[PDB]
Design a protein around this ligand. Structure first.
Ligand SMILES: CCC1=C(C)/C(=C/C2=NC(=C\c3[nH]c(/C=C4\NC(=O)[C@H](C)[C@H]4CC)c(C)c3CCC(=O)O)/C(CCC(=O)O)=C2C)NC1=O
Ligand SMILES: CCC1=C(C)/C(=C/C2=NC(=C\c3[nH]c(/C=C4\NC(=O)[C@H](C)[C@H]4CC)c(C)c3CCC(=O)O)/C(CCC(=O)O)=C2C)NC1=O
Ligand SMILES: CCC1=C(C)/C(=C/C2=NC(=C\c3[nH]c(/C=C4\NC(=O)[C@H](C)[C@H]4CC)c(C)c3CCC(=O)O)/C(CCC(=O)O)=C2C)NC1=O
Ligand SMILES: CCC1=C(C)/C(=C/C2=NC(=C\c3[nH]c(/C=C4\NC(=O)[C@H](C)[C@H]4CC)c(C)c3CCC(=O)O)/C(CCC(=O)O)=C2C)NC1=O
Ligand SMILES: CCC1=C(C)/C(=C/C2=NC(=C\c3[nH]c(/C=C4\NC(=O)[C@H](C)[C@H]4CC)c(C)c3CCC(=O)O)/C(CCC(=O)O)=C2C)NC1=O
Ligand SMILES: CCC1=C(C)/C(=C/C2=NC(=C\c3[nH]c(/C=C4\NC(=O)[C@H](C)[C@H]4CC)c(C)c3CCC(=O)O)/C(CCC(=O)O)=C2C)NC1=O
Ligand SMILES: CCC1=C(C)/C(=C/C2=NC(=C\c3[nH]c(/C=C4\NC(=O)[C@H](C)[C@H]4CC)c(C)c3CCC(=O)O)/C(CCC(=O)O)=C2C)NC1=O
Ligand SMILES: CCC1=C(C)/C(=C/C2=NC(=C\c3[nH]c(/C=C4\NC(=O)[C@H](C)[C@H]4CC)c(C)c3CCC(=O)O)/C(CCC(=O)O)=C2C)NC1=O
Ligand SMILES: CCC1=C(C)/C(=C/C2=NC(=C\c3[nH]c(/C=C4\NC(=O)[C@H](C)[C@H]4CC)c(C)c3CCC(=O)O)/C(CCC(=O)O)=C2C)NC1=O
Lengths: 27, 57, 162, 247, 161, 160, 160, 162, 162, 160, 160
């Protein structure tokens, strides 16, 4: 249940994380 | 002329093994007479060295 | 094999997308039953021999001809093989219950079961009856809540044979 | 691609995901799940880990398996007798040997060779000699020699002692010569004392089925091999490998 | 091979008496240190190749053993040396989790010494490599866990020596 | 039987039967008439042997028919006698076969697992087999009793 | 112990302990205080538990104390008490160890032949162990009684 | 395997009955024939090589095609395999004669053989002709009664290959 | 497996004939191309990694769905298995070219390959595309005549899978 | 064949051919012209070689064609000479192949069993192939005679 | 001997002698007198048997006595007769032991390779053994000559 809560947190915020990494390394 | 007690060490030259393989390389075993010629040939062809052989019976 | 988690992960990996609401619902449903299923699995693991005893007693009382001369279970060897098959069915039903999936039953039981029982002459209907008897005994032993979960996989085995 | 750019990106996602968690255990767990990415990228500074090669005879093809393919957790647990093990896992290794040779544990019938079990446990004989004496016994002869013609005996003995199917017409030909000339004892001696057995299992490891994920799999015997690696294999009496390689 | 629990159960079965207060206290001592041992196990498991690599660099790389005529002079012999260091690290981790040195003797020290004689392996360079591995492991796992790892590593060293 | 054992021993070696083996079959078929007489004597006296063996067993082991016993009750006692009948038939089969192979195939393989799944004590089985040994060897002459006693002994050892 | 099994399985595949095995050892060490408390609780109950198990066994299996039973006789009671004590000690050793290997090694591997030597019925063993389990679980808390139930039912199943 | 005594034991075990007069007559018949069977078995064991030589010479004289280039028995290896098959046919016919039953011929020779020969391209008609030649050669050495008895099992092999 | 010499030897052995002028013509023709074959095999051994890499690039460019989720190249594990199969095909095409006969391609590669791929779920058409990519890559590195020769065996593999 | 042998040696350990294997294949294909010339000469002279070899064999060992011998009679002498023709064809096959593989796969595996099934004396075959070696190497030049003698001598040792 | 095979078979199954092996031992001890009479008759008349058998062996094959055969020569004939004397001891040993294991342990295992080293033909062996069998069955009584012929047939089949 705790791991599923963590997974929910990361899947809600997935786009932000990927875009942030891309911005850090691209353009 | 029934049994031979053979202490032998067979090293490895074709590769390196990740598993334990320590008893597989050095070991002492009892071998029957009819089998000992073939077993000695196999050990010698593997490159291993026959440390000792004794007569048990 | 698979489990419920592997099935969900592969379902959402072949599409290439994160877990949606239905994924989290399935995972929550699987996790909610987890402690009940573990308790049932422990009870069955500790008491498999008993379940086999009463289940075989019920089967051979319902169908005496099996253990009389001319029956497929008439020999000490064939009786032992019968109870051994019952132990297989119980253990694999427990594995499937814990896995939450029927993949292990298809892979490791149903694959080759019809050929085996048709080659040996084992009665498939009587085997279905024995599996049903294990179903009632296990349900009585592990409680109704775990009884339903285990009966799902017992019914899977029974419908796999027949 | 740039490996440095990838490592920076994975570190950035690690930091970001650690940001949202607001819990030390969750942060460290996700940090480890990103540290595995970083560690694997750093570990492949040299080439990728070497592919596992299965050697062969001139009659059958030599195959490779990527090391990535094997380490998905499906590798079978080797049952080894260490001569210093206590009684419980010694019995565990013995039961594994029985399951391998007789396709199933025959304690379900109360059948065992007690003196052989004692010899293998106490170290008078090794696991290889135990397997050989077990395949040459009256029990094995009754289960897997009498009900079968010599070709089927050949194939099932490959399964029971080499952990694999026959891969060549030359292989079934040679082992049929051996069985037809010398009986079950000669066949079992030929299988156990071969180079492949010592290559794969050795003195102290019980044989296991070398099916998908364990080693590289041959393509030419696939259907027959996976018919053989099935508990319904003894229910078939017609040989399936001499016929296939002739077909 | 046995754990601390196995050893105390064997002792009290030989005596034939139930686990008294002393045995329970030793069991509590083992279980209390369990979290520390598990954390050090995490650290060794994650960074095992790094540790072995550092030990080889500090103990073996630029000594004459890797030079021609040395025991490590081959790709195969060098790989075998690194493989042996992997053995030592993994089985030291096993001994730590077991909190006992019996598995080291039964699994690692059973026939190793005269095997090294026969293959021509030097004992002293092996002990030096084990000591270097011990230093690297202690550095990675911190003082508390390094103290425990030191017992198993110098047990290996005494077994070689 | 003896012939089957010799033939499978030769078959597993890819060879014809040796002269010693052929002497085995010769001696075995020579004693066929005696074995047939012994089997006929046991078969004609089956019903009396069953009852005397049951009486001896229950007098020696009253617990089995005692309250809380395994054979307690009419149906359970009948099943006990039915098992004794099975093993007497198996002994006759082994006598005509010249070896314990029918006893081993029909009655010995998996017997302990069977009776464990039936909560049937094995010492009670050994005592019953001993009682039936006594009753059956009582009928036969000394040479025939010595022959039948060994089949009963193999049965007792298998049950124990 | 759980750690012993984990180390053996890790060596079997020739790699460090998996996160699943590491979490198994995590749960094992984290539950050490509770398991030791349960084992200590089993100790203060020495004569109590032994005698309720004994007389429950006598009620369930009167044949054992009935004439013709293997345990019939006053002298047999002295061996009964210490045998039940041995099995209880093995149960406690398994409880602290976290696995049934001390039970298997000390009192199960070779018990079958041992009680065949003494002409002891295995059903007596299963009924006695069930009586012990009933008494112990009755004395212990439900959560802990569930954990001890695996050990006691393993003892019963292995004894038969 | 199964022999005459074992066959009677099995047919009276399946029905659960004790031995009666008919079973004792069958057992007595086998016991009476046993001495003749043993003499025949010893004669064939002593002369097996000669029987194979003469039967093979007969077959390859009648059908020279089998040993000419393009024939199934054309190489030293294929010829040796052919004579090995004939040796096995003779030895198992001897085994079945000594046992008094044809079970070993089923389970240990003929179960799977015809499909093996179809895959291999072995001419089964020529093989049956060779078995008949073996029957003719063996009868002369064994005498009239043993010739009838062994011809039973040779014909069983020939019809089974069909 | 067999080369051109062994193929001629077999085709004259089944007929029971000595080598005639045509047989010596074929043997001379094979011996004429031996040095070219050795040179091409050595070149391909030198450049096998390059060929596999660039052919895999061409295949995954023209078949983008393979590496996307749901494709049979979608993971590093599954991708690595694909490139290992590519190495298989190149190695066995080199073997067949050096032998001068397609017997090894049928015996060690093509037999059972479609069944194995059907069991695994591998797309046979994409495998054929990868083999054609191999052919396109290899022709340039080996030159005109060696490209014709090695393209014969790549075509044989493609037609065997197709 | 040499090429097939190299390819299977490479395929055994899953690799492209080593430089030594390519070198041996290069040497084999470099010697093709003399191999074809020798095989062409032997095929051109098959009748002469078989005739002279049969004459020398029958003179050296008259007992083969003596009454009671294996080759006695026109038909059996014809079969005897047909076997020599077989082995000459196999020797030419092995010459073009570069090794004794066709010779072994056609006329060496099981040859002892075959000739025991025919009452053909093995020493007679050794003498026949030795005489045929003598006759054949008589026709060929000095360098080629040795390499043909290697094949004939392998076949002689195989029969012996 | 027979007790040897029974004992080793009992060892292979880790129990006492099964009833068929008991029938072995009973028949073997009961038939010791007649087989001892056979052995004494064979050893007392060995000198005549070997010389006569060599005579009809020389008669059967004119080729053997002819030059170029191993039989030709005075000392070579003495060696042949000495070999026949060796084999007669082995047959008597087998008759005493009731099995062919003494025969196998001397002169059966490896006999083909030995005679190939000696260049001695094997058909000569089988026909010589037939000669000894025929000369022995003449003087010896029919019941004894039966089993003697079975042993000689086994030894010849081993040679053939
Ligand atoms: C799990 C218990 C275990 C141990 C301890 C073990 C050690 C071990 N190392 C070996 C080889 C070797 N080991 C070494 C390493 C040594 N030489 C270097 O100089 C160092 C000083 C030193 C290591 C620190 C070398 C160089 C070889 C190759 C020996 C040779 O090929 O001659 C071998 C021979 C088998 C093989 O080559 O695969 C064993 C058994 N094996 C085991 O299963
Ligand atoms: C986990 C996968 C798996 C399964 C399913 C399995 C079943 C199985 N049961 C078998 C025998 C048997 N199975 C039975 C089953 C009983 N017959 C009665 O009528 C009942 C209806 C029925 C059970 C309630 C019997 C009587 C035999 C003996 C058949 C014989 O030997 O002729 C056999 C043949 C091997 C042996 O005798 O031990 C197999 C393979 N084995 C496996 O590895
Ligand atoms: C005991 C039960 C049993 C039998 C009998 C049996 C027969 C058998 N015969 C074989 C080959 C053969 N068998 C024959 C014999 C036939 N061709 C001749 O023309 C004759 C007409 C005829 C015999 C009289 C021949 C010529 C071959 C060689 C075929 C080949 O190698 O392709 C093979 C394949 C050997 C290989 O791998 O090459 C088998 C398995 N297998 C068994 O498990
Ligand atoms: C031919 C091989 C063979 C045997 C031997 C065999 C025995 C056998 N005994 C059974 C029951 C029984 N057997 C007994 C006999 C026991 N009572 C006492 O404890 C004694 C120790 C012992 C007899 C001396 C009893 C009392 C039952 C009834 C128990 C029940 O209701 O399950 C059953 C259960 C089905 C039935 O009652 O018909 C079988 C199958 N079956 C076979 O196919
Ligand atoms: C720690 C492992 C261990 C166990 C378990 C063990 C049991 C054991 N019980 C024995 C005797 C015995 N034990 C029993 C008691 C049993 N039999 C009856 O059937 C009852 C149902 C039951 C009592 C509940 C009896 C009846 C005997 C034979 C005579 C006696 O009472 O001492 C003996 C023979 C030596 C002796 O008399 O002490 C052993 C070895 N020994 C061990 O080292
Ligand atoms: C989660 C487990 C997993 C990953 C991530 C994975 C990545 C992956 N990326 C690929 C292609 C590629 N990947 C990249 C680069 C990207 N790669 C990233 O690590 C960088 C953030 C980024 C560039 C900075 C590029 C440019 C390609 C094109 C083909 C090539 O590189 O040759 C390929 C080869 C298949 C293809 O050509 O489409 C794989 C297997 N595979 C896996 O099983
Ligand atoms: C020497 C002859 C030979 C061949 C050819 C052969 C093919 C083969 N490919 C396999 C897996 C595979 N093969 C492929 C290749 C395909 N996937 C598609 O996307 C692409 C079109 C293509 C890659 C270019 C893949 C992806 C797998 C992995 C299947 C899986 O893991 O589910 C496997 C099973 C795994 C193993 O090797 O043990 C075999 C046997 N085996 C042989 O012995
Ligand atoms: C291509 C491989 C191959 C070979 C070699 C071969 C030899 C061969 N030789 C045969 C007969 C024979 N072979 C010989 C030759 C021997 N006689 C003397 O002892 C000489 C020492 C010696 C010749 C130098 C004779 C005389 C026969 C006739 C035997 C007879 O028909 O009774 C036969 C039986 C032909 C038939 O059915 O009638 C074969 C198959 N067959 C093959 O497929
Ligand atoms: C009891 C075990 C035993 C056996 C079986 C045996 C056979 C035998 N006979 C020998 C001599 C011989 N034996 C013969 C007789 C043969 N020539 C004719 O074909 C006869 C049919 C045939 C009769 C067997 C000849 C000719 C020699 C002289 C060979 C030589 O010394 O070069 C030799 C070599 C002795 C020597 O010269 O130093 C052996 C080993 N010896 C043994 O110790």
């Amino acid at each position: 249940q705790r791991r599923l809560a963590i997974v929910q947190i990361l899947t809600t915020n997935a786009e932000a994380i990927v875009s942030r990494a891309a911005g850090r390394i691209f353009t | 002329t029934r049994l031979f007690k053979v202490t032998a060490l067979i090293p490895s030259y074709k590769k390196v093994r990740g598993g334990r393989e320590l008893q597989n390389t050095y070991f002492t075993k009892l071998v029957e007479y009819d089998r000992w010629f073939a077993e000695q040939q196999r050990i010698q062809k593997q490159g291993g060295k026959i440390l000792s052989v004794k007569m048990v019976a | 094999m698979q489990d419920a988690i592997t099935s969900v992960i592969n379902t959402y990996d072949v599409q290439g997308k994160y877990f949606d609401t239905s994924a989290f619902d399935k995972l929550k449903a699987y996790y909610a039953t987890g402690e009940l299923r573990v308790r049932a699995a422990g009870t069955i693991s500790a008491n498999a021999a008993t379940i086999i005893k009463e289940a075989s007693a019920k089967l051979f009382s319902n169908q005496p001809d099996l253990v009389r001369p001319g029956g497929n279970a008439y020999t000490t060897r064939r009786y032992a093989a019968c109870v051994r098959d019952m132990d297989y069915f119980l253990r694999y039903a427990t594995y499937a219950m814990l896995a939450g999936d029927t993949s292990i039953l298809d892979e490791r039981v149903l694959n080759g079961l019809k050929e085996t029982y048709n080659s040996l002459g084992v009665p498939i209907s009587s085997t279905v009856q024995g599996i049903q008897a294990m179903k009632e005994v296990t349900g009585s032993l592990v409680g109704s809540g775990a009884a339903k979960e285990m009966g799902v996989y017992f019914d899977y085995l029974s419908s796999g044979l027949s | 691609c740039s490996i440095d750019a990838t490592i920076v990106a994975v570190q950035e996602m690690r930091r970001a995901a650690t940001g949202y968690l607001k819990s030390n255990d969750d942060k460290e767990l996700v940090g480890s799940y990103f540290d595995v990415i970083i560690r694997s990228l750093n570990a492949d500074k040299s080439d990728t880990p070497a592919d596992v090669v299965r050697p062969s005879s001139p009659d059958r093809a030599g195959l490779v398996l990527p090391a990535i393919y094997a380490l998905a957790g499906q590798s079978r647990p080797a049952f080894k007798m260490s001569r210093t093990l206590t009684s419980a896992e010694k019995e565990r290794v013995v039961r594994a040997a029985y399951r391998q040779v007789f396709e199933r544990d025959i304690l379900a019938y109360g059948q065992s060779i007690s003196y052989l079990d004692s010899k293998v446990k106490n170290g008078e004989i090794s696991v290889k000699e135990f397997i050989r004496l077990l395949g040459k016994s009256e029990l094995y002869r009754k289960q897997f020699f009498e009900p079968f013609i010599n070709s089927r005996v050949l194939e099932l003995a490959f399964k029971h002692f080499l952990g694999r199917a026959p891969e060549s017409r030359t292989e079934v030909q040679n082992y049929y010569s051996i069985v037809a000339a010398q009986g079950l004892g000669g066949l079992v001696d030929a299988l156990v004392d071969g180079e492949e057995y010592g290559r794969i299992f050795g003195e102290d490891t019980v044989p296991f089925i070398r099916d998908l994920g364990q080693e590289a799999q041959p393509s030419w015997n696939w259907g027959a091999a996976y018919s053989l690696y099935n508990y319904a294999a003894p229910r078939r009496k017609v040989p399936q490998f001499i016929t296939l390689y002739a077909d | 091979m046995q754990d601390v629990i196995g050893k105390v159960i064997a002792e009290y079965d030989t005596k034939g008496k139930y686990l008294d207060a002393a045995a329970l206290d030793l069991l509590r001592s083992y279980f209390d240190s369990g979290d520390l041992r598990l954390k050090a196990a995490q650290a060794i498991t994650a960074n095992a190749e790094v540790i072995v690599r550092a030990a080889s660099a500090k103990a073996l790389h630029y000594t004459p053993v890797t030079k021609p005529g040395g025991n490590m002079y081959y790709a195969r012999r060098y790989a075998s040396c690194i493989r042996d260091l992997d053995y030592f690290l993994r089985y030291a981790t096993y001994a730590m989790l077991a909190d006992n040195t019996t598995l080291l003797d039964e699994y690692v020290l059973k026939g190793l010494t005269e095997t090294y004689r026969a293959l021509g392996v030097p004992l002293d360079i092996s002990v030096r490599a084990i000591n270097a591995l011990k230093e690297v492991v202690a550095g990675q796992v911190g003082p508390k866990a390094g103290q425990e790892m030191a017992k198993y590593f110098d047990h290996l060293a005494k077994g070689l020596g | 039987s003896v012939v089957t054992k010799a033939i499978v021993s030769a078959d597993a070696e890819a060879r014809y039967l040796s002269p010693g083996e052929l002497d085995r079959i010769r001696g075995f078929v020579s004693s066929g008439e005696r074995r047939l007489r012994v089997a006929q004597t046991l078969t004609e006296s089956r019903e009396r042997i069953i009852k005397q063996a049951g009486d001896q067993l229950f007098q020696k082991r009253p617990d089995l028919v005692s309250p809380g016993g395994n054979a307690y009750g009419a149906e359970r006692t009948a099943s006990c006698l039915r098992d004794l009948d099975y093993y007497l038939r198996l002994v006759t089969f082994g006598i005509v076969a010249g070896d314990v192979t029918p006893i081993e195939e029909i009655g010995v393989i998996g017997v302990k697992e069977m009776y464990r799944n039936l909560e049937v004590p094995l010492p009670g089985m050994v005592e019953a087999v001993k009682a039936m040994k006594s009753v059956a060897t009582g009928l036969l002459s000394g040479d025939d009793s010595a022959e039948v006693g060994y089949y009963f002994d193999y049965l007792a050892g298998a049950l124990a």
